[PDB]
């Protein structure tokens, strides 16, 4: 049996970037044909690993992460990047080895009236670490102390993406899949 990539990329529902979800893909040999030549993907960059050679790999231990972001935020799904997405929602290690995939989902994730189901975090004390995930929704104060609304200087940290079918491509929704490759040599004990 081959690795079930279709259930990741072709899944019906995708999550908000702040609540990005991770699928382990192992105990399978991967047929990368479906990603290599397609008309499906608008963005496809690989980092650290050879973009040409992924079908050669033989001992697969990959993690697939899924989320939705706005077109201009796809730039932030890269190593060493700054911004509200990279800092507070999904951070990629400098040493990243793996691939970053995204495709326009305007016709299925945006509406003329506006789809506000997708969310991102925009306030946080301190940047996420690589592959860290934060689904907390607690009130935020710019001085770090605890906080109870409706007190002054007390804010909620999540906000909606608003996806309309009339905006430019930079504001249209994009489904993203990040494939991370475990290190090839892991020491369990001495």
């Amino acid at each position, epitope marked *: 049996n081959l690795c079930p990539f279709g259930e990741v990329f072709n899944a019906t529902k995708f999550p908000s970037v702040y609540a990005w979800e991770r699928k382990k893909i192992s105990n399978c040999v991967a047929d990368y044909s479906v990603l290599y030549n397609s008309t499906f993907f608008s963005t496809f960059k690989c980092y650290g690993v050879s*973009a040409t050679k992924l079908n050669d790999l033989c001992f697969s231990n990959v993690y697939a992460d899924s989320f939705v972001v706005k077109g201009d935020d796809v730039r932030q799904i890269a190593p060493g990047q700054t911004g509200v997405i990279a800092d507070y929602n999904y951070k990629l290690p400098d040493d990243f080895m793996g691939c970053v995939l995204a495709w326009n989902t305007r016709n299925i994730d945006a509406t003329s009236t506006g789809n506000y189901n997708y969310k991102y975090r925009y306030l946080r004390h301190g940047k996420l670490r690589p592959f860290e995930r934060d689904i907390s929704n607690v009130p935020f104060s710019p001085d770090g102390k605890p906080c109870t609304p409706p007190a002054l200087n007390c804010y909620w940290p999540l906000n909606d993406y608003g996806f309309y079918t009339t905006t430019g491509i930079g504001y249209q929704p994009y489904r993203v899949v990040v494939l991370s490759f475990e290190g090839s040599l892991e020491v369990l004990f001495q």
Partner: nanobody
Amino acid sequence: QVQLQESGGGLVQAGGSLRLSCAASGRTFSEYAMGWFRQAPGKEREFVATISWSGGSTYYTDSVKGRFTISRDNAKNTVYLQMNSLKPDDTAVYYCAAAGLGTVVSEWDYDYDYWGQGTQVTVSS
């Protein structure tokens, strides 16, 4: 050192065809992705199509989906853009562009490191 040059543009009229070409130099052409961009007068430069180093995977902007065809010739060190059923909207200066290391495909102008000068394409009606 590493440069592109456009060719094959000109005057055509609505419903005709035009076959753009772009020759590259400076490194191995078969190791990088290429992409076509265009800029209507006044409006900002937008993306048209992109081809992988192998020619296997492609992607197009919607305004041309079904009409335009991107293909390459690694033996010939050049990538083309067949344009059918042109419409006055398609008037633009067409920029050839080459991607960087690790970029399989991209519709994003910031992911291409080298740009050609552009060839005029005018469709009139």
